[PDB]
Amino acid sequence: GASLKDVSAWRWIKTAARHFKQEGKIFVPNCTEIMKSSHGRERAPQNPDWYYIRCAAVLRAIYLRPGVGYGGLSKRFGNKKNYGSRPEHTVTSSTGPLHWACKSLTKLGLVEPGAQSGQRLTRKGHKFADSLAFQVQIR
Amino acid sequence: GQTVRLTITSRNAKAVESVTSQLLTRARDEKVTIHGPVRLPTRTLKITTRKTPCGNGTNTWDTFELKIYKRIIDLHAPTEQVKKITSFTMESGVDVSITILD
Amino acid sequence: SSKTPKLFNKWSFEGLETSELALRDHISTTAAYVPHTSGRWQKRRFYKARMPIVERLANGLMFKGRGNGRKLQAARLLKHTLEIIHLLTDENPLQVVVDAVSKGAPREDSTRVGRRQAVDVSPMRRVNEAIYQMCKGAREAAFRNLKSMPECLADEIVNASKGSSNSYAIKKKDEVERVAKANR
Amino acid sequence: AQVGLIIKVLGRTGSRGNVTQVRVRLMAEAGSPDYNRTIVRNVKGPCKENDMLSLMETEREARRL
Amino acid sequence: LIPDHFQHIVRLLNTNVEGKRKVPFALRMVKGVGIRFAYLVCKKAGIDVERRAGTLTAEELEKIAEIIADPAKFKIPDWFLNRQRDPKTGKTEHLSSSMVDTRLRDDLERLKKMRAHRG
Amino acid sequence: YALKQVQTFGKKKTAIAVATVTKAAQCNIKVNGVPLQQILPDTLRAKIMEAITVVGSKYYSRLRIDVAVHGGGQVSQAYAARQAIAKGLIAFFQKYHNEVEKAALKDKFLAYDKFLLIADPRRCEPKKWGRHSARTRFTKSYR
Amino acid sequence: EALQNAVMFDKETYDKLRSEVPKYKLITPSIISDRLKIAVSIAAAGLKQLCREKLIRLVSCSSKTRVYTRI
RNA sequence: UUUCGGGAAUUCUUCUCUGCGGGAUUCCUUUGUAUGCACAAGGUGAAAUUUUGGGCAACAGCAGGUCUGUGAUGCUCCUCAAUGUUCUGGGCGACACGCGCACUACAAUGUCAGUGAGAACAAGAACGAACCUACUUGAUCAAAAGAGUGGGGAAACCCCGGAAUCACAUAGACCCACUUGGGACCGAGGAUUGCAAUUAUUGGUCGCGCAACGAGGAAUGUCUCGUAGGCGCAGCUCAUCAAACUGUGCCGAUUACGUCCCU
Ligand SMILES: [Mg+2]
Ligand SMILES: [Mg+2]
Ligand SMILES: [Mg+2]
Ligand SMILES: [Mg+2]
DSSP: OOOTTSSOHHHHHHHHHHHHHHHOOSOOOGGGGTOOSOTTOSSOOSOTTHHHHHHHHHHHHHHSSTTBOHHHHHHHTOEEEOOSSSOOEEEOOOHHHHHHHHHHHHHTTSEEOOSSSSBEEOHHHHHHHHHHHHHHHHO | OOOEEEEEEESOHHHHHHHHHHHHHHHHHTTOOEEEEEEOOOEEEEEEEESOSSSOSSOOEEEEEEEEEEEEEEEOSOHHHHHHHHOSOOOTTEEEEEEEOO | OOOOOEETTTEEOTTOOOSOGGGTTTSBOOOOSSSOOOOOTTSSSSGGGGSBHHHHHHHTTOOSTTTTTOHHHHHHHHHHHHHHHHHHHSSOHHHHHHHHHTTSSOSEEEETTOOOEEEEOOHHHHHHHHHHHHHHHHHHHTTTSSSOHHHHHHHHHHHHHTTOTTSHHHHHHHHHHHHHHHTO | OEEEEEEEEEEEESTTSOEEEEEEEEOOOSSSSSOSEEEEEEEOSOOOTTOEEEESOSOOOOOOO | OOOTTOOSEEEOSSOEEETTSBHHHHHTTSTTOOHHHHHHHHHHHTOOTTSBGGGOOHHHHHHHHHHHHOGGGGTOOGGGSSBSSOTTTOOOBOOOTTHHHHHHHHHHHHHHHTTOSOO | OOOOEEEEEEESSSOEEEEEEEEOSSOEEEETTEEGGGOSSHHHHHHHHHHHHTTOGGGGTTEEEEEEEESSOHHHHHHHHHHHHHHHHHHHHHHHSOHHHHHHHHHHHHHHOSTTTSOOOOOOOOOOTTBSSSSOBOOOOOO | OOOOOBSSOOHHHHHHHHHTGGGOSSBOHHHHHHHHTBOHHHHHHHHHHHHHTTSSEEEEEOSSOEEEEOO
16 A cells, blocks of 8 residues: 655645645635735745645645644745845744635645644545555556 | 652752762661652853953953752652651752652 | 665776876775765875765865855766766766876976976876866856856866867866976 | 886975975886986975876986985 | 747837846836736736747737736735825825836925925 | 564764664665655765665565654764664674674675764864854954 | 847747757757757757657756757 | 554663763884884774863063942042033934945856755743743734733743755746846835834835946955854844844865975
8 A cells, every 4th residue: 555654745745736726626715816925935936826735735744743733834834034135034934824724624624623732634634645645656 | 649759959069969869868768669869951051251341452251150950859658758758957058849749 | 685886876887997007096996876975084194095086076066155065966966967978978977087087187397496496296186186177167167158067067077088178177287287398 | 208106205395395305216117228217306296105206307306405 | 939020129108128038027127017016917917927028919018008007906905006095195006107206206305395304 | 473673873963863673574664754765865865775785685684674863964864874774784683693694794884884883973163252163263454 | 248049939940959959969958059049948948848759868857957868 | 564643551771861980091013213202104992192172371571451340449620500410302323535344245056936854052930910932813815913722930831942054856937138146225005112213213015126246456364174164043232123242053175284485
């Protein structure tokens, strides 16, 4: 068989995002076409499917490290910001888009509000991630 | 029964080892089950400042340090029995606290 | 079931040799998989003569403030460079680079002991100088240019191995050796 | 360009100490002239015994010390 | 492939725009349109951002000029615009193509006439 | 039917790798849960794979090796991992084989690299006041 | 250095890409950019097509570097 | 067969924590010795020459600095419309100029948009709360910021401390141009700290970018191994603000291992 973490991270993320787009029941918010992924960026995302890729990356990031919140995920998706004539510093990503991503995955039935504090995968979400991993291995 | 945790803290390494040793000898004399002693990580407080009282000359600094030592001991005894073990002439500069765990 | 290593799992170290008899003890042809080794090669005086030659090339690409300390990037540039060298010459790329190192430095120089006075060049200095001049010539050729660094470095190396004057290193070697003859 | 073998290092010379004086043996052939010949030269880089040299002209000699 | 109507300079809002550039990066040559704004104009006009500006047609130019003139009619939010509550008129608008320079001269004359510190 | 298991460690700068080697049904080497063929970049993967190819893969025939690495950075963690794997094979052969085969593996590792089995003692030098780094003094101006 | 490199690949230079570029040894986006006087962006797109139709063979690939040769 | 729970149950100290100990001595071999004191190369080894890096450091002096650290001080000056003290406002921040020390760059060994893996030193509040933080809410639609439950006397919470250089077989965009390089200067909304933000707070959004700058004359600073250089992170100052300082880790070289030409 196969499971997540036995396959390449990018190929899993790319395959899952393509799955979300084709099934067509995901609830993309309207602000995804207007906003930047974080205030540490300078331009808007250049991939028109950037929201599906972010949702798939969030799902993989909850499979590892269950019980994670929006603040924890914002460290994973942060970057270094260009202040003009001053030195650079690290900024965490905006948590608003991460809040939308978890809400979308909850409406699909893949994420649960977690036991004590954070976010968690459901049994359906765990089944989805491993079946996708086997498809990637088969190619 | 209950479990009593003893915490020993001091500024001087020698006195903290002296106090912990006698607390262990008397506990074994009274035939009590013991956990530890545990040497917790030692912390150092640093302060660095200019040596000159004014602003003249080459800028030189001196750094002062201060070390804190900590040990803990766990006992299985009632409160009255523990007090006899704890009571003796402890050296100056050593703090000993008593707690009951859950 | 051990087998001998090949660089980037592709290029063979078997039969590697230099035709310059005077440099045979200062160019190391030891087999390895990748340039990275993370050793203490500057502890003694001549210990650096046992560092494998392709890694010495990689250490010559981490030069300016933007390039200092980037060894993994230098390894990737060399991997692409060797493939282009093989296409251009149809020979073993490892043999081509040791030929270039054997020719890229002047055998006679003039120093300021005497005006100037002509002296001979130690074999250790000949291999140090060949690597330095070949990397410097390729870095300047790619500064504001459509050509990539791998393409610029490949041309410099194949020209040096042929003794062609189109190489940066060969051109400077002809000037230093000509001036030294004047100050004999 | 003949080849010579360094058999002795006669100290470091010149102002600033970047030149070394050595004596070298012209290996050459086995029966031909310039065989077992010795000569004293100045060398620019770092060198030690048993190093080999490439000599463009084997006719000049270096002044001692 | 090259079309017969490829133009090396396209005239848009009294500005000469270089036709060799990608569409969003040729539209930022208009005063009042930045890189963030130019991408949004292409989205509301239904233009692929991977084309070159020299292939744009006459009907495509009129649409782009109309979006830039009134971005709020095409559902571009107010926080995106460069003059949100005009100190004289109170209306939210976007300024472009030499209205940027005229309004700048108006603002400095406003501060000098009342003799404020900034003006 | 007993458990044949050993544990070793390796260190480079601040990274510490701990390897558990156990006899199993099929060979399997993982680092922090990731199989070796998934490790990136290829340069660092070939560095770790040296602990296998130097002696040969026939000596890892039915061994399951799991490596946990913490501390350090991208490159020092790769170097600590390969040291833990090489030392793990020696420790396993010392416990469940005789001395002739172990000594034959040990000198092959040492003939290739000393740091495959012995840790590098280098550490960062402390910073001093009046200097920007360990050794760089402040800029001096005369006029 | 005017360097008037075209960005849109007219029909005359399309023939040259499909006819003689395959006959070259050591194809690279920068190498045929100046032989045909076209921008590197459309040179790399034109070479990606020939790799799909199996007219040239890929030799070394990376996220930023690609070098081909003849069949 | 693998994988998951920051189920449960036994037993155990490889990794972590630390008070006192061990360990290196030119110890062993061979050179030249110059037969004494020693040296060079190798061996042993975690480490091989002051093991590495710091702290401490004699005697004599300087009319060096500090009377803006003190309830350390002689002499002298002011002392009720005070040179004492407090309160209001302004200034210490003014500028077509000169000099020292920094920060950001001039691009393709790059900029932008994604995705991966992955440190160390630290800090946290005075009848409960004034300090630091996680989580979810705000959200049937922007950043950042309102707000609500909790936790932490700090190996216990933050925290499995998801740092930035870095990597990517990402089939992504740009193509040698003052250009998607650079980001100075300025315009218009809005929020936050504070008793008070204009003469001077600080984040965030759209615009300006048409301001120089395409590698820098004579001169000149620092540096020999986990070093230089590059990269971020803590502490300090602190209600609010770090292009500084004091520390910490990460990536990681070229060259010499010499001399008395200059100082
Ligand atoms: Mg930058
Ligand atoms: Mg100074
Ligand atoms: Mg511009
Ligand atoms: Mg000048």
